[PDB]
């Protein structure tokens, strides 16, 4: 039972988003007039409306994608929309392909991809994680936002070994609080006009929070997108001990705290962008050789999916959906191995 009000919004965002030709989002390019009657009436059983997952891209038509997701069940109840959106983001995903099964893999064939540290200045594995039962930041109420703080925080203070540390709330942070974590680049703030035109700034800082471990080396998000954003990081290239002390973290919570996961699409994010794997697996890498050459760069950064972004890069894995964590992780892992072994062998 879709109220009138957001009868009239919806229709007035369609509208909107026929009337702007200039506007190149996934939202514009895939809600027609069919897809937007498949989807205008329908409500999630926690309350989420199809005016909850567009109207970010509505409000800011400058958008990419355009689309978010308000719980975990709008992905399947507004399939319509979210399927081709997710298809062409994640470049050949279709409707009909599935995400395959959890599976980290053999962290014993994870190597160091720098162990001189010649080109690697560090490496990050990131990933993200939705609490079962809860709407996802668009829709969380106050209480939502308080108690789930009150479950994380309580699951934070029990880590122990390499994950010991501190949670820090956002509410009633102090200045000197903050400067600290600015200094360590562990902050995060309010969301842009993205994320505020999707509801997903409410109630700020009820419920917002990081936690990260006495070494520096292990980083939470809570709520600053997903429920978690869950970060791995160290100085110089040894993926080994920085995935598996990521997946010790996320293991560890999860036994204390179901994650919202689908069958056909992994684990389900508030952006569709971060689904699959969640996986984003990155160094920062010095390649100055290559950086003089760029069209042998680009031919591994290609065939090993990664996505390259002076002398010093950040590169990534470009995919998280259709393949496992432990292929995201080796496909870095490779793709890194043979631009060094490039930049070893150029002139
Ligand atoms: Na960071």
Redesign the pocket.
Known sequence: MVDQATLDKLEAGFKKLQDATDCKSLLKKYLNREVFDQCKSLKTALGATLLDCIQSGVENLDSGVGIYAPDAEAYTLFAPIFNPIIEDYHEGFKPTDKHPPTDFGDINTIVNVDPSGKYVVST?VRCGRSLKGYPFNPCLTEANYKEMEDKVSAIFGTFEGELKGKYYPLTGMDKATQQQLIDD??LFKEGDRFLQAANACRYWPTGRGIYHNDAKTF?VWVNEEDHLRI?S?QKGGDLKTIFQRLVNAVNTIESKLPFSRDDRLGFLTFCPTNLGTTIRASVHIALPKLAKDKKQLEAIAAKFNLQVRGGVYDISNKRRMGLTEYQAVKEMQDGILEMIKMEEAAP
Do not use: N
Request: no cysteine.
């Open positions: 990050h680049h562990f980083l970060i990081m």
